[PDB]
Amino acid sequence: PRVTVLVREFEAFDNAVPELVDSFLQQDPAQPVVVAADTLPYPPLALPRIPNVRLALLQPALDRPAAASRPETYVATEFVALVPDGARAEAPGLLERMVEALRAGSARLVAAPVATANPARCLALNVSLREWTARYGAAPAAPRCDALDGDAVVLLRARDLFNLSAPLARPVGTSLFLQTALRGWAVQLLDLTFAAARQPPLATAHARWKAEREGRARRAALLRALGIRLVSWEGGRLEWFGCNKETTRCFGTVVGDTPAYLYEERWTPPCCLRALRETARYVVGVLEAAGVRYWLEGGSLLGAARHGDIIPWDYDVDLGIYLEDVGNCEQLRGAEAGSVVDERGFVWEKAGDFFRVQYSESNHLHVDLWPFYPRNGVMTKDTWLDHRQDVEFPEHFLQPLVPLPFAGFVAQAPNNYRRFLELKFGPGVIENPQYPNPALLSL
Amino acid sequence: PRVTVLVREFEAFDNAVPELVDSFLQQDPAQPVVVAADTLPYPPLALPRIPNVRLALLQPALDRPAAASRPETYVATEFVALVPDGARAEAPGLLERMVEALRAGSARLVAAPVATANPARCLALNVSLREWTARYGAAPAAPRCDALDGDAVVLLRARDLFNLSAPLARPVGTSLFLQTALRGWAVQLLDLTFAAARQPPLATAHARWKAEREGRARRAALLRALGIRLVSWEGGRLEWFGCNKETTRCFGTVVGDTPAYLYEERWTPPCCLRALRETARYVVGVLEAAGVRYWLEGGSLLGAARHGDIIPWDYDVDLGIYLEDVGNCEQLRGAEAGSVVDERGFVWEKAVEGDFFRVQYSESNHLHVDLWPFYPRNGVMTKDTWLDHRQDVEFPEHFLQPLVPLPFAGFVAQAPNNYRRFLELKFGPGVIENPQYPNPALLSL
Amino acid sequence: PRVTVLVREFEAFDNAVPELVDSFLQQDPAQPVVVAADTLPYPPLALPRIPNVRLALLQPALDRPAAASRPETYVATEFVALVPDGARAEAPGLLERMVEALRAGSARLVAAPVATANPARCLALNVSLREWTARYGAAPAAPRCDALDGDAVVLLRARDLFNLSAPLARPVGTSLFLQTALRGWAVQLLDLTFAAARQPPLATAHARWKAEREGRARRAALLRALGIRLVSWEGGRLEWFGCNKETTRCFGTVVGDTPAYLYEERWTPPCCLRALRETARYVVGVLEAAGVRYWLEGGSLLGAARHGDIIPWDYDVDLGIYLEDVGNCEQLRGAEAGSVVDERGFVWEKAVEGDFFRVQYSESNHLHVDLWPFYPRNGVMTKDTWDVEFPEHFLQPLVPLPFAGFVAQAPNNYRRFLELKFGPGVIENPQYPNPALLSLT
Amino acid sequence: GPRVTVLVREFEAFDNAVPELVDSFLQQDPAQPVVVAADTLPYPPLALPRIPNVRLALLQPALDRPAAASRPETYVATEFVALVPDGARAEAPGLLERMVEALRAGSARLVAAPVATANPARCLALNVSLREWTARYGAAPAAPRCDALDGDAVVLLRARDLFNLSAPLARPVGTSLFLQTALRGWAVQLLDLTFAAARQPPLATAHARWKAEREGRARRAALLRALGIRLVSWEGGRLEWFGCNKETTRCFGTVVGDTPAYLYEERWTPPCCLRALRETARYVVGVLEAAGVRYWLEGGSLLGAARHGDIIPWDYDVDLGIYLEDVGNCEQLRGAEAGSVVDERGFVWEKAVEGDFFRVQYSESNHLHVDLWPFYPRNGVMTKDTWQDVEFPEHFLQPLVPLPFAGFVAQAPNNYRRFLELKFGPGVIENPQYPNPALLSLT
Ligand SMILES: Nc1ccn([C@@H]2O[C@H](COP(=O)(O)O)[C@@H](O)[C@H]2O)c(=O)n1
Ligand SMILES: Nc1ccn([C@@H]2O[C@H](COP(=O)(O)O)[C@@H](O)[C@H]2O)c(=O)n1
Ligand SMILES: Nc1ccn([C@@H]2O[C@H](COP(=O)(O)O)[C@@H](O)[C@H]2O)c(=O)n1
Ligand SMILES: Nc1ccn([C@@H]2O[C@H](COP(=O)(O)O)[C@@H](O)[C@H]2O)c(=O)n1
Ligand SMILES: *[C@@H]1O[C@H](CO)[C@@H](O)[C@H](O)[C@H]1NC(C)=O
Ligand SMILES: *[C@@H]1O[C@H](CO)[C@@H](O)[C@H](O)[C@H]1NC(C)=O
Ligand SMILES: *[C@@H]1O[C@H](CO)[C@@H](O)[C@H](O)[C@H]1NC(C)=O
Ligand SMILES: *[C@@H]1O[C@H](CO)[C@@H](O)[C@H](O)[C@H]1NC(C)=O
Ligand SMILES: *[C@@H]1O[C@H](CO)[C@@H](O)[C@H](O)[C@H]1NC(C)=O
Ligand SMILES: *[C@@H]1O[C@H](CO)[C@@H](O)[C@H](O)[C@H]1NC(C)=O
Ligand SMILES: *[C@@H]1O[C@H](CO)[C@@H](O)[C@H](O)[C@H]1NC(C)=O
Ligand SMILES: [Mg+2]
Ligand SMILES: [Mg+2]
Ligand SMILES: [Mg+2]
Ligand SMILES: [Mg+2]
Ligand SMILES: [Mg+2]
Ligand SMILES: [Mg+2]
Ligand SMILES: [Mg+2]
Ligand SMILES: [Mg+2]
Ligand SMILES: [Zn+2]
Ligand SMILES: [Zn+2]
Ligand SMILES: [Zn+2]
Ligand SMILES: [Zn+2]
């Protein structure tokens, strides 16, 4: 029946951790309390220097053993209560009751809101490591929940908390439930509530604005570190944490037609797909504006026919165009002389006998334009690459072209495009997805 | 179930604590371990400087809070396990079996012996603070004991251990069980054995001798601090820790006729009583051989009439003698010229206070027999000096004609005939039947 | 098998780790080999899929248990051999030759150079965390070293390696010996040599540039993360890793006149002292040219009298000046009308609160010299704010005294000067930082 | 409701005015909480009023009492405690709370009022140094603000402050309290209020006083030994010692490794041990100079002389180098190879086990020592045959230079700075290793 209060979410420049710890100490002078930090907080916390109150510094240090940063080693009790800064212990026995709430219930974490300006509300949460995405929403089975948002004391067993890979990664409210929801654990939000501190931290607009900013920075670094590129919400809100126009793309050059993320049993990072989708939309826009006749090719046509979007592990977009229209588009005229950075940042190059448009000078997510010319009613070209799907095809497949949803817009595809896709890939290609190179890595 | 190992019994100059602690760490790397020492052990213990292994220094220090020397602040777990030096954890999960045994059973402590040359064995023990006595014997209902002798891992709840007044006084083997047995607590000796250290401490004959010496000195200091004058064992073995012939008596000058121990709700220390009996016996023998007519007086006669022994809170022995007999006894003759130390170290002297003699056990220990000389006037025994006590009166000489034998303090003493009537005349009716402290207005039974 | 080969220093884009692994299995099929990486290396390594070869990915992951990112999990042997990329096992049975060497000797680490272009050289190393410095030099007791430079297989007991805080932090060649030297452990460089890979990694100038760019960035992040602000070779060729003119000072704002580094049981960062010496010399150079009578004051005069430098745990320089002299310095006159950033980046300010001047290293780095103006009153040096008054004869004359790399002026009889303001014996009894007492207050 | 608990700790059981003290405070508030603390039950009996707010707190372990019984805070329900010394009396109602209003309205954590005895409390300065095992008393420069008191004072502080010290009621309280509070930087403000003396004051005869002063001094000397105070000084002088000397053992035992016990307790060398080493160094030097042995400071002694002219504060021996061709001129030295030599002044001179050096110990029992290292000049370089210890050129000794050290003048090698850096490394004088307790804990 012994519970270690463990404090991790606080700002060194402005906290109420002294009040927090003293408030628990008034209910039990021998109360085990562990304040955790990456480095020594300054200005000093000035905690009581008694054996049951310890400061656990989790960063590596040349004069400290491995144990010194492993937090479970500061915790001897069966249960641990994560307490946010701004909380206060007043009524005695509140942790005893969360403990017997836990043993009675079936959720492996119980939680009690702190009566702050943002008391913990309950959230649904699915984590897709394969798609680098976490999706929150309202919780159907509240007070049974996957995740919380807001301030709460969270009690669970030390064996449960400290077997996680990142038990106290900040922000705790995000990092913890990402790991427990993935494991299928539930948090049950009890009806107990902890009081707020009497002199709460971040009392001024300047202080809380500095806290929020540093807090947004920790959260971004956390999600980047743990393979979450995108956080989405019921209602449509999106939080992006990956590549954009000014960065590089999220993965290096692709060997064996098998991108790095597949070997990590992951698919294309959602920010990379999104850059491809806007490059695709942009390139189609200037192609159509130039009167260049284009059509979805390769995996782009496949993904469009299969589910109207980029195949979730693909990393480029492929369009075929008529060779004799190439001249009508300015960017492409220039691309034959050299690389072309147009007024919107996209990079047009010729390299191969095809053209490539890159999202930006730094982000090399590309659209490939393959020019074909007709010879005896057969679309062909003069340079080949060793792939099953790089072949000639009858021109009647382009007479006419048909509207086909793709990557958020309506594209042009060959008529009878399922027959077209069967021609280049083999029978059943639409219904039988497979990785770009099953020889090395197969879905 | 989380259990803190707590090491309190070891010697800084030769121990196996590093191996003890490391052997528990090889079963659980985050095992909470608390080494408790009065002062920082030198040479260094060199325990792993890791957060789950702490060293509790229970000394006062100018730069530490009160909590620093209170061992409960170093234990966060619900159960704690006292582990003696020389024990090593072999079998994984030995303490988990101890915790569930304790919750299944009804004893507040459970114990596992360690496979040393002296594994813990079951003992009975009652403690009598009023008589400063601890009485050990064989355990009637083993494996449920009041106390153990020898090396054991003892597991209990921290709340129970650290509500004791001296949880880790040394030797813990003695200290712990006097406190738990006085509280009616049982220790269940389990059929679980911890292994001994592969390199046991005290390997040399010189170190064990040095180790036993500190232990015996620590043990004697413990019982003196706790009011245990006498430790008795079935089979009759007696260990004493009070006064003796060559020290001072246990208590100081008695004021108000009420000795210090009575206010502490204890009776006369067993060592003082024993000195008084052997002084009473010896003086009676001197007086008989010298031809001095004596009889038991005051509290000595009263105690004799009640149960043939000194009243359990009394501090002296009183005898009456015939004044015309003092010249018969060599020690009494010298006493009037000055204080005399005789053939056996007893000190005979005439008292400052009116006209009586006093025989002290030794020069240093002033437990004493008082010799009150009386002389007859008209068949009335009297003296020229009188203390201001109610039992200090004249009495008819016929009470002394003749004397009757009466057991007292292990020998047969001489007493007034009709000593009931004698005692009631001096103390008031019913004195024999109604024991009472020497001054009820200050401290009553 | 008593040794687990553990390879940590390699690059995903160009390596010879497959050759490395293969070479050791060709000598023993059962050889335990762990390739450690922060994330899954790409292009794939395609090492043998056997139980004794395991890839340890040490970064925390949402789907993995805590044990998965701890290197001791992947090692079940008594000894670990740290093998750098580019090494290769050619002769058989040299890892246990390295074991029999470790057993017999007194060093906790043994090492054998790899026959690369950069084979391991024996190095001396002392780590002072209180001075945030790593001092390297040639090894006086070679082949017994405190550190290596270059390619070597290093073998030590797995219990020793994985008990350190940062056992596999990169670069290993730097992180390992910063940890083991600090513990006073030694490394014995054997007369044994590992062959190089027959297809050595980073064979091109471009690959080597990419590797060194990344390796230098790792090294700088490691030194910062472990509080090594200065690295030196034989007292020279200094490499800095702390603050400078374009950053903030290392310790931020000071509360209770106790800077952060004291609570971390250290002295002033050496990059901060270097800035303080530079500002003291710059300000003294500016006062001497403007014709401003100054003298060292407080802890700078005490430092100068004791060892002729800034006291190694102090964080500012203090100078006394004549108040009537301030009008002769452009910055001082401008500082009284507001904050001044002069031609060389120092900011001269007139603290409204204390009635004194302050010259900071730069707009961002607030290490500062304090200027305290006195004016003569009836023979005594005084001011209107409050550190004591003192007779003027201490300044008639003023005396050359070495301090912080240059000759500054101090009160005459400065030992008596110091004794009056600080107490007798002050020069001989430094208040050494007291971490124990600082905890109590 | 009363907010102050009177606490009485300094009295003698054989002679006291505690019954009068207690009656005086109850005479002004019959519900006033009063606690009398003692190690054992005071005899002769105190016979205090058998009332619930008067309690005897017996502070020693007892076989039949709970832990709380020997803890003084158990006996105090108020925010404030007034330590009252025997001999004091409450004649003027209301002073207890004027001390409380004064404490609240001021900035010192303790306030005090003198008792109008023959020894009324005087204001003192006190800096404690655990590293140097010294308490340094002096006149209080900022009176009425003190670090310590001398004499009889009712001292009032918060219960929470007093009972969180390690030895709140250790005797004599006038020593133990202020050693602990001055160490923390706390201040005691001696108010301008006065308590009356007992109408029948305790210890009114010389014999009674003599008994009380002998017990007090014994408690004080035990208190300083237990607490690691080896030297009390008044205005830098009037030294009072509580450590080792010529007839005791030396404070630390046999040293293991190169680390004496005092280092692991985060202290430096005991001042008694430094004092005996200065006495021995001077004695040894005086003997060698009289006998005509060429000596010079060596090792850490030369380093201490160069740096600040004394033994380095955490060093435990003195080293001197001597010319071997000169040993025959010292009687104690020639006898030293025959065997151990106690000289006329108690110093023990012995030849090395096998190390080939001479050791002069302060006494047979106190093994603080000066080591004499003989060298000879092979080709102008100083050598010994078995072994900071290094060869060094002989010209450093031609000639020898005077150098102040340990309260006298000793001979040093010429250019001792260059010498020291050959021996220890560059800049050894200016950057002193003071012991790192953490690193030594790490090892
Ligand atoms: N049966 C198949 C065959 C290919 N594909 C995908 O279609 C894409 C074709 O790549 P290209 O656009 O380079 O032709 C690849 O991402 C490949 O994995 C698929 O999803 N199902
Ligand atoms: N009714 C009584 C009266 C006295 N006594 C005891 O008898 C003793 C008398 O002491 P003296 O005769 O030595 O003066 C005391 O120990 C006293 O307590 C008793 O046990 N019962
Ligand atoms: N006796 C002293 C007094 C100060 N010093 C140090 O020199 C500096 C002088 O203090 P101020 O800068 O506060 O004047 C402080 O770091 C101080 O502790 C010292 O090293 N020895
Ligand atoms: N830089 C250094 C090096 C050694 N020392 C001191 O030198 C002494 C060791 O030298 P000895 O072996 O000569 O005694 C120790 O007191 C040690 O603290 C020092 O105070 N500063
Ligand atoms: C989580 O996934 C489940 C599928 O099992 C789905 O029903 C639910 O809507 C998802 N919730 C969120 C917030 O995405
Ligand atoms: C993980 O769980 C196991 C089993 O409950 C436990 O033994 C271990 O200590 C846990 N790990 C921690 C607490 O780091
Ligand atoms: C682990 O490291 C710490 C160093 O801080 C040390 O005290 C401990 O004994 C080490 N344990 C082992 C087995 O080396
Ligand atoms: C403890 O008390 C019981 C009950 O009087 C008694 O039978 C038993 O003998 C006592 N124990 C000892 C060891 O004398
Ligand atoms: C004493 O027991 C009580 C339970 O009645 C518990 O709350 C308290 O913590 C215990 N005290 C110590 C010092 O362990
Ligand atoms: C490193 O420290 C040792 C300590 O004795 C010193 O003597 C040596 O000269 C130092 N070397 C360097 C390169 O600083
Ligand atoms: C106490 O410390 C101050 C500051 O170091 C010093 O000036 C003073 O003399 C010290 N007091 C005594 C009595 O030593
Ligand atoms: Mg494609
Ligand atoms: Mg393509
Ligand atoms: Mg009697
Ligand atoms: Mg009598
Ligand atoms: Mg300064
Ligand atoms: Mg300043
Ligand atoms: Mg020395
Ligand atoms: Mg020596
Ligand atoms: Zn991306
Ligand atoms: Zn006795
Ligand atoms: Zn810096
Ligand atoms: Zn000493």
Residue numbers in the entry:
A (entry chain D): 47 to 397, 400 to 491
B (entry chain B): 47 to 491
C (entry chain C): 47 to 432, 438 to 492
D (entry chain A): 46 to 432, 437 to 492
Manuscript text:
To understand the molecular basis of the unique substrate recognition and catalytic reaction of FKRP, we determined the crystal structures of the sFKRP-CDP-Rbo complex with Ba2+ and the sFKRP-CMP complex with Mg2+ at 2.23 Å and 2.60 Å resolution, respectively. We tried to obtain the complex structure of sFKRP-CDP-Rbo with Mg2+ but could not. This similarity suggests that FKRP and NTase share a catalytic mechanism.
FKRP recognizes RboP-(phospho-)core M3 as the RboP acceptor and transfers a RboP from CDP-Rbo to form the tandem RboP structure. Our structural and biochemical analyses revealed the acceptor substrate recognition mechanism by dimer FKRP: the phosphate group of RboP is recognized by the catalytic domain of one subunit, and a phosphate group on O-mannose is recognized by the stem domain of another subunit. Indeed, mutations of FKRP, which is involved in synthesis of a tandem RboP structure, cause congenital muscular dystrophy;17–23 more than 15 missense mutations in the FKRP gene were found in LGMD2I (limb-girdle muscular dystrophy type 2I), MDDGB5 [muscular dystrophy-dystroglycanopathy (congenital with or without mental retardation, type B, 5)], and severe muscle-eye-brain disease/Walker-Warburg syndrome (MEB/WWS) patients (OMIM ID of FKRP; 606596).
